[PDB]
């Protein structure tokens, strides 16, 4: 994985912006507590064998002297190991916040929550990539920082310490054995992941014959069915997935061999290397004039060799985890590339859109879907603020395609388009959109709260806007202007359309779409809404099947879904 | 959980039927290798400290004497340790097979795969209750057998051995400290699972505001959208789920306290109790007149106290796992009771069904849906073998209720019914049912090839049956009478209906239902099928919307869907 490091650097520069920040501060703090954690671990090794030497030296003075050193130093030892884990966890959180604040300026920039989900197919689940995969990526880049550099400082320190303690060949025949036996064991157990997938395949298709029996049992039951679908499930279970007995038999024999040359013969090698200074009376540098320092020197060397040996089991596992980290940075870099692709207008684009006021002419503009299939050839019409348009047709596949192009939600396949910008086009579907929040932020949704007051507005004006739609009892009944509850369930039917009309009245757009929305609204207040929009100047694009709504539309556009149209 | 043991006993008698079987044999073998594993663990404790005493006694004779004992005994130690794991795994598999061969005799008895699915509501997913929860239950009843009795034999053995080695108060002040400090730690860390759910709630609703943004982005993008839905997700993240920082701060302080009184102060207590025979120079029974055998006695007592202390951490965890085992035996006993309930008929039954030949009369019998509704007040008609019946109506909700009652798939809501038993009623839906297996078994499905010969039939006759349906080229195209690949994909169209008609011809039932099946079959083939059925005498209950198919039905039944019928 050569490009994995190159891709990981780009993400790292996002999560470590400058050289003076808390993330840089935590990185130094963890590195300081990684070094000081190894010293505390060695100090326990040296002090621990001095409590034990004083116990069996039968001196109460030596036992008290070295037990009190342990008691005095354990508040500091516990501080080091536990403030290192605090620094790791805080770095995981700081990394996640740094990435999220970068993956959400690109995501929610112009229309990218929409284009990346319902206009391209690069990412199947956008949501799972911005909340779930971001958390696991950050939890693995500092996990690899710790799990790789923690059992590496002591590897260097124990090799440096076991040398000049059991000789240079001491922690080298242990390295040779742990590596040679590790490679041989891994090669020997090759058919473990080979028959793990076979078990998973047999498990996966044992649930299939069960699910196929249930979601299809209607026909199996009329004619008897059982005793034939019973032997189908039985054969998949009794015959197919009972290699577990062959899998269990292999794991027993493999376990019998890997528990000898990696668990008991590894210690036999450990005894041999450590015992060289002791079973050699002509050893000048080390023990030659020692009486009970032989005891402390052995268990210091014996405990160091055990920690040096078991640090490889954690540096090997850390390298294995790097493959998972390589998988995560692939999806993050894929998501980052996709977000940067759509932010420039990529996923088409030949046509030009020029922002104009009260001009919506579609002069020589096709109606191609984002794939490219043109369904309307020669759209050419203009309407002005003051004349309504009724859209007619059997709603096949083109009714909900002119609006998407109109709102710039879909690409323009050539031609010149004039229309107001995003803030003036309004679309009201059959079920209106209710916002997660209070009752006040359902009338003023696309506007915020702080910038709502600067428009010279008041809650009384919000009430009278909401009163014009024949809805004044909900405000008092629900709990007030700041009552927070789910408005998709606590509201059902006409009141949603009434609140949508109230929002439209409050915002006062230039053009509005009423696609099969006014279906549970009284006809008198419907005419009132039409008159209000006409007198204030809210042009409406009415889509309806009711024949009585044909008196407030100066123009009329019809789509057949076959290729032609009349205006 | 008093009844949990009572329920677990009933399941155990299923998986341990008699006192002479493999499960009894494995249970004794595991118990034998559980006792002999503790002896091998103690023998390593005693032998291990004799290699170390020989090393630092600087005698090569003692090092070789006790290293060769370790080398000679390590094939047997590994054999004992890995034959226990083999016995556990084999018991897990033998338990799963014993339960499955009991949960599938009750499941596939008469219509219970069908009744439990869409006639009861006790189990929502019966599929993941006979393959997935059965495996995890058996994997936990013997995991509890090992994980509870393994760190209990050594608990008794180490207490018996540490006593008379460091005195009776030795492994009692350690029991007192571990139990008392364990309770204090658990009580102190009460607000860990209390704020774990708060994090999960905040995590779960951070994914909600993301998913609600995606599955609803169509209307959001038509407004300006962002800067209002951007601050909704931001507030759920930046404000709400940063209790992690308060969760991280608590875990640092809580960890700082539990790493002192349970990790470093536990050893300080361990030093104090073990050291009593040594610093007491007047200890008469123990090492009063000994050489430096205090070395071997200390580390034998020191290693035993560490294994005795750490055997409690596994007996505590074993008890915690019992709660999960209590959950599993609830679903297994719930499934077992539902299986036994339906085998007699429960979920109704007022009417009586008496088997007969060629008569399907419905004198004074309603067609009630097995819920609290009735769609036909009283059906009353009879047909004779040889007279086809056409069923009319726009198949709303009553057409697919006469057939279910006819096949005994639904209960009889009073009245007297005469009809042939399960093997003679036939129902062919719009898409026929194809069976996992060869091409031969798609013609003879509810029969087996083993019982296919007892009818005096041959593959030539099967081909002849396949010839009458105007479909004979598929046999030699797919690979013969043994082509295995699934037939819901290779066949797409009228071939499935042709094979269903071939199966109908082969089985020669008394009555058959042709509910909207013949929709991709040429009219000549329809006439041939009807003529062949009339000649042989297979009465047909035809459901069709074609007016031309009205000349070969002596009778005619009409379900208007209002509550009455026309026969
Ligand atoms: C500073 C400079 C001067 C020099 C700097 C140079 C440095 C940086 C070099 C850096 C090298 C690294 C970076 C290179 C890595 C490349 C490699 C990763 C790639 C592969 O392709 S490689 C694939 C498999 N590679 C394995 O590496 C798995 C095996 N990894 C294991 O870690 C063990 O195999 C296991 C833990 C499973 C062993 O089993 P454990 O029992 O679990 O550990 P152990 O058996 O090895 O112990 C050892 C022994 O110490 C002795 N000992 C203990 N206590 C004693 C006592 N009281 N008295 C006397 N002796 C004692 C024994 O008695 C015995 O102790 P026990 O542990 O058995 O009790
Ligand atoms: C046979 C008859 C005569 C009598 C039969 C009677 C029997 C059956 C009675 C049966 C009792 C049972 C059934 C009742 C259970 C009821 C209970 C479950 C209900 C609760 O409501 S209870 C809720 C929490 N209950 C805990 O129980 C958690 C804490 N459970 C732990 O298990 C550990 O706490 C942990 C694993 C965290 C170990 O803690 P750790 O600190 O991580 O290890 P450790 O330190 O404790 O080991 C101990 C020390 O031995 C000394 N020792 C070691 N090496 C030495 C050396 N070389 N020299 C000298 N001394 C040494 C130390 O120095 C040191 O070990 P080292 O740290 O030195 O290595």
Author numbering:
A (entry chain B), B (entry chain A): 60 to 406, 428 to 647
Q: What did the article's authors report about this structure?
A:
Human ABC transporters ABCD1–3 are all localized on the peroxisomal membrane and participate in the β-oxidation of fatty acyl-CoAs, but they differ from each other in substrate specificity. The transport of branched-chain fatty acids from cytosol to peroxisome is specifically driven by ABCD3, dysfunction of which causes severe liver diseases such as hepatosplenomegaly. The overall structure exhibits a two-fold symmetric homodimer, with each subunit containing a nucleotide-binding domain (NBD) and a transmembrane domain (TMD). The helices TM4 and TM5 from one TMD are swapped to the opposite TMD, i.e., domain swapping, which is a typical feature of type-IV ABC transporters.
The phytanoyl-CoA-bound structure of ABCD3 was solved with the addition of 0.5 mM phytanoyl-CoA during sample preparation. The phytanoyl-CoA-bound ABCD3 adopts an inward-facing conformation open to cytosol, similar to the apo and substrate-bound structures of ABCD1. During structural refinement, we observed two symmetric cryo-EM densities in the TMDs that could be unambiguously fitted with two phytanoyl-CoA molecules. Unlike our previously reported substrate-bound ABCD1 structure in which each C22:0-CoA molecule crosslinks two TMDs21, each phytanoyl-CoA molecule solely binds to one TMD. In detail, the hydrophilic head group protrudes into the central translocation cavity, whereas the acyl tail is buried in the fenestration formed by TM3, TM4, TM5, and TM6. Specifically, the adenine ring of the 3′-phospho-ADP moiety is stabilized by Glu111 from TM2′ (TM2 from the other subunit) via a hydrogen bond, in addition to the π–π interaction between Tyr330 from TM5 and the adenine ring. The 3′-phosphophate group of the ribose forms a hydrogen bond with the main chain of Thr326 from TM5, and the β-phosphophate of the diphosphate forms a salt bridge with Lys322 from TM5. In addition, the pantothenic acid moiety forms two hydrogen bonds with the main chains of Ala321 from TM5 and Gly372 from TM6, respectively. The branched chain fatty acid tail forms hydrophobic interactions with Val215 from TM3, in addition to Ile374 and Val375 from TM6. Site-directed mutagenesis combined with ATPase activity assays indicated that the chABCD3 variants with single mutation of the substrate-binding residues (E111A, K322A, Y330A), supplying either the polar or non-polar interaction with CoA, displayed significantly decreased substrate-stimulated ATPase activity, compared to the WT.
